[PDB]
Swiss-Prot record:
Record gene name: PRSS1
Family: Belongs to the peptidase S1 family.
Co-factor: note: Binds 1 Ca(2+) ion per subunit.
Record EC number: 3.4.21.4
Disulfide links within the chain: 7-137, 25-41, 109-210, 116-183, 148-162, 173-197
SMART domains in alphabetical order: Tryp_SPc (SM00020)
Keywords for the protein's UniProt record, in alphabetical order: Calcium, Digestion, Disulfide bond, Hydrolase, Metal-binding, Protease, Secreted, Serine protease, Signal, Zymogen
Subunit structure: Interacts with SERPINA1.
Catalytic-site annotation from UniProt: 40, 84, 177
Protein name (Swiss-Prot/TrEMBL): Serine protease 1
Cellular component, GO annotation: extracellular space; serine protease inhibitor complex
Cofactor(s) the record lists: Ca(2+)
PANTHER family (alphabetical): RIKEN CDNA 2210010C04 GENE (PTHR24264:SF15), TRYPSIN-RELATED (PTHR24264)
Length: 223
């Protein structure tokens, strides 16, 4: 997150770190056995880290559970990142409590202007690189479709939206994707891609989760 603020420990109880000997992607717990992330974060050897704040120190509240199955949406396209969504089943269920909680899936899509919170342990710098120890937060609004498509003409499908700061300075970045965009207590987006960060007139592009609720529930009911 470029231009964000320290969240505060365990204030975003649904946020997970995907780990393979270091942090590389975010995710969201949507029930005790399933995590929603980005299809682009897929790799084998994923360990899901729950209840985290300082990703480099064991502080209490953490649950480390291995991924059992990662189910990349079958129409994921890595060149366009269309349908950038992935389901991870936990090898074992998490203990839900105040610090480890699931986030609701939406029943309707959200409108332009809705404010949302985006979080992650990704890069903090637009130029260069600096990875935080603790979880960063950013309040950002969903932008209109027209503003999104004129910023990335030809690259925005119906499964994407642009949340942020056309001014620059505030945006999500590398290592944040796979993580949550929560608006009014509903997981509305997954951090997916953008042109640099916190780049002026290049807002962040996000997977539109409301388009995927039936698929998540059917895929979860059969696995
Ligand atoms: Ca830790």
């Amino acid at each position: 997150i470029v231009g964000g603020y320290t969240c505060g420990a365990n204030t975003v109880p649904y946020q997970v770190s995907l780990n393979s000997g270091y942090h590389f992607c975010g995710g969201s717990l949507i029930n005790s056995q399933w995590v929603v992330s980005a299809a682009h974060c897929y790799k084998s050897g994923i360990q899901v880290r729950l209840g985290e704040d300082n990703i480099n120190v064991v502080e209490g509240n953490e649950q480390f559970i291995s991924a059992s199955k990662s189910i990349v949406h079958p129409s994921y396209n890595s060149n366009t990142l269309n349908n950038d969504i992935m389901l991870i089943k936990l090898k074992s269920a998490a203990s839900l409590n105040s610090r480890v909680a699931s986030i609701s899936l939406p029943t309707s899509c959200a409108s332009a202007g809705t404010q949302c919170l985006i979080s992650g342990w990704g890069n903090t710098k637009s130029s260069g690189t600096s990875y935080p120890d603790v979880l960063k937060c950013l309040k950002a609004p969903i932008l209109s479709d027209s503003s999104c498509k004129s910023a990335y003409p030809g690259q925005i499908t119906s499964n994407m939206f642009c949340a942020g700061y056309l001014e620059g300075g505030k945006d999500s970045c590398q290592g944040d994707s796979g993580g949550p965009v929560v608006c009014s207590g509903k997981l509305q987006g997954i951090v997916s891609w953008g042109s640099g960060c916190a780049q002026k007139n290049k807002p962040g592009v996000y997977t539109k989760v409301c388009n995927y609720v039936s698929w998540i529930k059917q895929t979860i009911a059969s696995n």
